[PDB]
Symmetry: D2
Subunit: 460 residues, 4 copies
């Protein structure tokens, strides 16, 4: 087997050992593997996959293959691959093009190696995406391949936004399942995953004590909520910035002071609008928004000396790293850990005190400086992915008449019943015991003993 490209194939044995452990940590995913094995519901599926090539993604890949699928894989981020994971996958005869520390050029080349097989477009018919880069390349650069593709299953908030834009503009060519908005994804992965992995990544990069220091978390969505808890539970004094007053209300009630980097919250683009007194006290800033330029150049100028800057949103443009490349000198401490010296561009004193520490060059810090979410959390997200792949593959959108296609061209979530069945396997993994409603109780609250237990409007 040579249809791959990884950092070091000799890491495969190590990756396989960690894959075996991860399988024991992912009961929902492994449960699907045993349930659907004899049926082979993905036989004939040829899946283009683009998501962080971690140990956890390895278990997802092998679940899809075990259910009958062929795949070609790459990572959706230059720093998120675990090289032992990519090596174990390649060693198993699965095409994977991913390594930790890709250049942007290599990142694009890796996506192209999955799209093309032996010089020609692969006969792909399914897409699994995290962020939407692969989805967009197919629409812009390989639209004829989408004629053969039955659906897209998208993992993350940013990718869902990009799908809804295409649907709104009439440019989405195949239906999609919003995997992010399963409760066992968004309210598990996005929140608790970042709770586990944000302080993890900061410790590995800097080994900084967090207790007693000042943090500013930009955003209080699902990622912002879990990120704030990751820091608060270590004893940081956390302040939260938000543009959504409802999310700000939650931050207040959760015990956080709500502040803005700009005086009265108004960014007029001038340095005068920066709350310099506030930013001059911040030891750590974390962006979690999925928005653009939420930690801008004037904020970076005003930050306390030696503050840590990192981003756990999907794309690095949450921080204006371009400004820092243009104006300030970068000192690599170690991979994915740079000191940014604010004294000049073309040199720095080795003992300069006026620097910031930037983690993963602004790319998602939990995957860049650690290993991302733990297996038992990703088990939920990826059990949803497998169910979403099965759902859209069985629909065979590409084989339907143009009339029927119009009725099925949508961006939908999985039924709540499947959301609940994933959650049950997760609960059992903890040794939890769910109570069974009696017939009288089920009738009293108007549900079936089997579920679903909540109306679709329920927010949990």
């Amino acid at each position: 087997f040579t249809d791959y490209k990884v950092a070091d194939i000799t890491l495969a044995a190590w990756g396989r050992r960690e894959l075996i452990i991860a399988e024991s940590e992912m009961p929902a995913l492994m449960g699907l593997r045993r349930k659907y094995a004899g049926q082979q519901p993905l036989k004939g599926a040829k899946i283009l996959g683009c998501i962080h090539m971690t140990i956890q993604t390895g278990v997802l890949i092998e679940t899809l293959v075990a259910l009958g699928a062929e795949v070609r894989w790459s990572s959706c981020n230059i720093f998120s691959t675990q090289d032992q994971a990519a090596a174990a996958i390649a060693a198993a005869g699965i095409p994977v093009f991913a390594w930790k520390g890709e250049t942007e050029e290599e990142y694009e080349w890796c996506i192209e190696q999955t799209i093309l097989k032996d010089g020609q477009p692969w006969d792909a018919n399914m897409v699994l995406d995290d962020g939407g880069d692969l989805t967009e390349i197919l629409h812009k650069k390989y639209p004829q391949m989408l004629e053969r593709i039955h659906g897209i299953t998208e993992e993350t908030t940013t990718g869902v936004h990009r799908l809804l834009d295409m649907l709104k503009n009439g440019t989405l060519k195949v239906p999609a399942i919003n995997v992010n908005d399963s409760v066992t994804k968004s309210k598990n992965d996005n929140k608790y995953g970042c709770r586990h992995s944000l302080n993890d990544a900061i410790k590995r990069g800097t080994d900084h004590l967090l207790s007693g220091k000042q943090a500013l978390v930009i955003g209080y969505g699902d990622v912002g909520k879990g990120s704030s808890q990751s820091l608060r539970q270590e004893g940081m004094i956390v302040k939260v910035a938000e543009v959504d007053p409802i999310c700000a209300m939650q931050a207040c009630m959760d015990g956080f002071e709500v502040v803005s980097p700009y005086k009265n919250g108004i960014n007029d683009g001038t340095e005068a609008s920066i709350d310099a007194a506030l930013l001059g006290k911040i030891d750590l800033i974390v962006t979690t928004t999925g928005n653009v330029n939420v930690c801008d150049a004037n904020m970076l100028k005003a930050l306390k000396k030696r503050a840590v800057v990192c981003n756990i949103g999907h794309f690095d443009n949450e921080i204006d790293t371009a400004f820092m490349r243009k104006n300030w000198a970068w000192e690599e401490v170690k991979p994915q850990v740079h000191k940014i010296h604010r004294t000049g561009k073309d040199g720095f004193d080795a003992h300069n005190d006026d620097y910031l520490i930037l983690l993963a060059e602004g790319r998602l810090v939990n995957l860049g400086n650690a290993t991302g979410h733990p297996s038992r959390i990703m088990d939920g997200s990826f059990a949803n992915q497998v169910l979403a792949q099965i759902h859209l593959f069985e629909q065979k959108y590409a084989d339907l008449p143009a009339a029927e296609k119009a009725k099925r061209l949508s961006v939908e979530v999985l039924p709540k019943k499947l959301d609940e069945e994933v959650a049950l396997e997760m609960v059992k993994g903890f040794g939890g015991v769910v109570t069974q409603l009696t017939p009288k109780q089920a009738e009293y609250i108007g549900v079936s003993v089997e579920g679903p237990f909540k109306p679709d409007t329920y927010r949990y």
Copy 2:
């Protein structure tokens, strides 16, 4: 010359008025609506039948509605939740209120009827504000002619919303309703953080028991169960959680709780054999939060650790099988809303018996029964939604619509997200919080207006 009320002690009005003035300073969203709408008088002509816990916080709600032009007739939705100084202050303001702490069930029904009738005949009501649905059902069953002229119902709580949706499904709901519970600044504020504040509050006032180091079992992990578990865990309790919803159970696990069932393998076959006696024999405190029926049953009550505390914070007392305890065991009142229930028999007890349980508020909602319910700054969000919902339905004038137009608007709906955000903004400012304004580039990048709404309707927060 005003006598159109019944409260426990009108001499408590000055005290209640002092606490209302304090509460106003704790409720900026509600007092913001007062200042914003006072000149416009959007409720001029509204005549509101109100049934919700007659607390200091409800007093501020009542006076906001009146300040916006409404007349009201008020009762409590629970026999133990009234604060007598609040009821007295409202009555002293010239507002008909029929409520006191410690009503009997017969007095409870009488109070509701005193709001429905004025001088022995139906009041010219045209709006309903309800918490739980008792008033709503009485009107549908007994006063359908009054509903003809009523423009809407604004319902506060999860249980009431469920009852409204049953009526709408059956075709028996007579007037449209706003689901006030499912505003985010209600459900994810009141239901969760309010119980966080007030559950351990009520337990302390009733028993003064140390909570740290003891074992608790919370039945349910929806919004009330989430807030209740935190109220106990933050005090240092070792908290276990029961759930029938595996999604909510998954959240309990991730939040750091052990998820257990009172029944072996979670199967309640009705027999004492199915009870996990070893588990229940260790529990010092059980709290029901489900809005369901009989989730702390007779067999669980028999198996509970001696001297365990039993309480409910769901809306209705049938979450616990108190009827079994009245039939079989001897009740000794420690003090109002605190009873020792001696499992040694129905007739008499030894004053030094050790085989008893402690029941709070006779199974009624414990935060309002043994304390004062949610604090003003939390109820600010819920009651700002109530005022916006009254304005919304009153302006629509459903009762005046022709039959064909009524049919298109007979629904149970929530307020628009923009209003939810505007309530939240006033709450955030009340804490001194500063929200950031999106730049035009940022607003375009995430596809929202600089003014909001900032999230799609599918967003769960």
Copy 3:
């Protein structure tokens, strides 16, 4: 029986019901009652007791009586008595003079009614004190009564400091046991007691939401640590002030921002030294120091409008309430809750917004606005009190030759072995199971299987 003065004797039955419950919450105290009942170790003891007349003190009193002692009792604070507990004690034929809401003159009168029986000095031979007021009165006004007193058992930090002042000055006339510095007192009562009862008292007095609001705790000793946790666990944003750098270091590591009411921590006595910006954002200030004037007039002037002010140290002079009585207008909301209108002295407007809320008129707020520490915590403190009374009464200091007295005139703590045996009964009250060292393990760390398990230097 008429040798008492309580607010309402008809509250006795209610207090008895709560005493029966408290007995079930105090296993260390009830274990001493049963272990020593037959031996009657306090036969002949006549104890002058001065400590908050709560339900928990009732169980302590009846324990002392059950072991053979006679007592004459009063409260050490004008607001700390629970009237149902006072009535239940009086109904049992025990002399007690205490009610909630005493004046200062009635307070001084109550202590005198324990000192004197039928107009003559009681023939007391033991003292139990909390704060040292009774101890000082006996030394200053009734020195001849101390000739027959065998010892003093002092409950709290402030009282112990006063005993140590008398000892170093040669004015102490009888030996004393420092009950406070048992670990099952100081590191249980002082810390976790205030954790339980500080937020309890604030809720009862004001029903204010605490989550999301700003607090300032003055002091970070045992009371300050417990108070800060009582607030932080409710979601308050808590800042801590301290003069001790070591205690301030613990506050930082515990996740609190450490601040001073004064610029650079320097109180020059002028309003210019007040950090007006800091204090203008504080919603709640709590004094925990046992020191004087730690919340002074200039701080009270700069506090945010409608801030809550309270003290949980032993004496009210931690707050300059005298300044507030002289210059501002007091409005009583209800007992132990006053609005202090900073608009001036001669009349307030009922709708004025510029006021502070003072709890318990500056007296210890947990006992003033709630019920103090819960029974299962006071179990530890009062088991120590009983052991201390037994210890000094057996020594019989008053009957010894002068050369032998000077040998035993000291302020002692109980031996660590008894400290541990108190803690064991507390642990068993929770259902906890300690492990028994094997002989090999005991030899390995140089202790007895029975304990003591730590050297006297150990700080826990």
Copy 4:
């Protein structure tokens, strides 16, 4: 041409120097001593044998000693605790250091001997800095003539202090010592908050296991056990605590933990039958924190839940009976310092066997073995104490005292509280904290100087 060292890879020096420069900015108390004492050179002539984890933080301590005038010869006190980039950077500065991560036991002993001997003969040492007491014991057993000229020992950790006090009461201690562990800015900072930071850190790096919602058992609740329990509980673990000390057990209860024993009724009867198999069958993670012997024994290891993680954060690996596991079960290395112990037999194993335990750092102290130990800003307190203790004993010059004067000073003592406070003040300033200054009236009221010390020596904090 400097060759008097042995490290894993000297080309890691530049990386180590970059991390030392960062660490200096995180250690203000240590860098304050460097600035305060540089001109005075109070350790001029001092020759320090150092044996403590060769981390970045120890690097800053070493260079502070040298900056104050000392020469050192250094080794690590554990086979897995060295950071190779730190050792390289120290060796590149011309400082004799013998340490690498992953030493064998034989290489461990050799490294200590390379510090003791220079060019084959005893070095002219006159001070000792130790963590655990291995170096101290080797000198007493094997190099008594060197101790004649040594002025003192400054011992870092609880286990080492116990060994010093044993020798003192036996009359075998040859030079005085300072107990550095029992400074408050050490024991109640390093031992507690250091393990809070670094225990979950090491567990994540080794296994990447989710901790939230899983079951842990912490053996011990002293300073290390307290910090370790918080490390897991703050992550959402359901933590149970074992203790032999009822006072420490009381604190665990009040801190919100269930206190349990691995043995039924806490009594080891010498058989598997006294093991609480039901309890241990539910534990996902066990951590030993005691400084005792065999507190996680063979029968406990046999009863642990399948796939449980086993680690030790006390100083020595004999807290866990790893010898039993080596003799009876098959070890599969996952990666360095992470082994699956297959309980199916000693010979081999099926790669998909489910009946295994995961052992971290082979039972060696896990925060340093699987991560980097305590963070710089915590070690700042410990190592500022170490510098002050070295100064204090070196200035005393015990070795030069006549016999009758030595007898008056042969002791194991702590630093004065005033110095403990001055270390804390620098730590507090590092956070931006502002301590308040007592007024003269306030200082008089509580009977202290405005400069401190602020507490009596009896105070426990």
